[PDB]
């Protein structure tokens, strides 16, 4: 390669073929991305269409059962299976494909194929960036979604008693996961979801602000009222006035960007940091190291029967969520709670 190219090998032929610029770039990463991602998406669609969760969660979660796009979901397996990988040949299904669907093995199938698909997609980003000679900042950015997926769908269930407490792949199932986190972990009070919320909201703010500011500081460059036509892809001059934007935001907001590179690095930086902080918080929750309570306020409320804050009300709400969701959310517990032990307000 460096001193000389030696002779062409079969690896060279494979590389030349895979690296062709066809409509769908496959590349070397394609051999891992395309099968894994295809099987993950197809498994999700088959599960949301035909597979049920009657034996896993005692819930109907497919189209053929009468569920719609919102309520259908590839539910996670039963809690008694623990963290079993649920191979279709494993000691649980023992080869029975239909029963493997019934036991919930489709969830493990989809999760593992999706994880390897995400690995393959970041590899694809690296390969494509190397092909066109660009600094692979987008793969570094995509590390954040991979961290979120790993911490939520893999680390968190492994920290708990089994895959049962993982997010089931679906809309309403994800909403159930969110409300479960609020009720049990008090996830809103956790400073890491706080940093994640700040990162995501700031990223949306930056997206909107940058788009609007660019679209409202454009140079004329044309005579039509449609400003989109007055742009050439190969032009060298900037299409919008950086000086005007800087002055405007300096006089409106107080501070303003003066460096395009720094501006776009900040746009890249904010959401990635937010998602990584949220991922660390989710790891902490996986270990049940939850920021549930402020012990000083609990002690003061216990001693003082008239001290109340919004935090105590949130604690009461969490208690209600846990008590009223435990019986049906976790069937393996077999919680036959009589109606007199469920916490409840007045006349409600």
């Amino acid at each position: 390669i460096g001193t000389y190219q030696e002779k062409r090998t079969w690896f060279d032929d494979a590389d030349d073929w895979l690296r062709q610029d066809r409509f769908v770039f496959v590349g070397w990463s394609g051999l891992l991305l395309l099968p894994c991602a295809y099987f993950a998406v197809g498994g999700w669609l088959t599960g949301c269409t035909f597979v049920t969760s009657w034996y896993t969660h005692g819930l109907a979660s497919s189209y053929i059962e009468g569920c719609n796009f919102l309520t259908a979901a590839v539910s996670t397996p039963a809690n008694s299976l623990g963290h079993s990988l649920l191979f279709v040949w494993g000691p649980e299904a023992q080869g029975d494909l239909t029963r493997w669907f019934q036991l919930g093995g489709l969830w493990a199938f989809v999760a593992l194929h999706g994880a390897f698909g995400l690995i393959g997609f970041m590899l694809r980003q690296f390969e494509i960036a190397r092909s066109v000679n660009l600094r692979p900042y987008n793969a570094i950015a995509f590390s954040a979604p991979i961290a979120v997926f790993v911490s939520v769908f893999l680390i968190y269930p492994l920290g708990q008693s089994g895959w049962f407490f993982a997010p089931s792949f679906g809309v309403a199932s994800i909403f159930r996961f969110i409300l479960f986190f609020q009720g049990f972990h008090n996830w809103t009070l956790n400073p890491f979801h706080m940093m994640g919320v700040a990162g995501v909201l700031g990223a949306a703010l930056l997206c909107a602000i940058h788009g609007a500011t660019v679209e409202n500081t454009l140079f004329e460059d044309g005579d039509g009222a449609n400003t989109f036509r007055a742009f050439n892809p190969t032009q060298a001059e900037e299409t919008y006035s950086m000086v005007t934007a800087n002055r405007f935001w300096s006089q409106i907001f107080g501070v303003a960007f003066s460096n395009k590179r720094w501006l776009h690095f900040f746009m890249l930086f904010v959401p990635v940091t937010g998602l990584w902080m949220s991922a660390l918080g989710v790891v902490g929750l996986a270990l049940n190291l939850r920021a549930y309570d402020f012990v000083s306020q609990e002690i003061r409320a216990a001693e003082d029967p008239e001290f109340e804050t919004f935090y105590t009300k949130n604690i009461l709400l969490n208690e209600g969520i846990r008590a009223w969701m435990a019986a049906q959310d976790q069937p393996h517990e077999k919680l036959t709670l009589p109606e007199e032990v469920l916490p409840r307000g007045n006349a409600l």
Binding site: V243, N246, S250, G254, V255, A256, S258
Partner: peptide, 30 residues
């Protein structure tokens, strides 16, 4: 005493904002 610490932290953040607004380094054109 906790209230004193919280107030000090908020005052520090507001002072940092004030300095970053009115004592910023001028944006040097070219």
């Amino acid at each position: 005493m906790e209230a004193l610490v919280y107030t000090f932290l908020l005052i520090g953040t507001l002072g940092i904002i004030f300095f970053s607004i009115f004592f910023r380094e001028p944006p040097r054109i070219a």
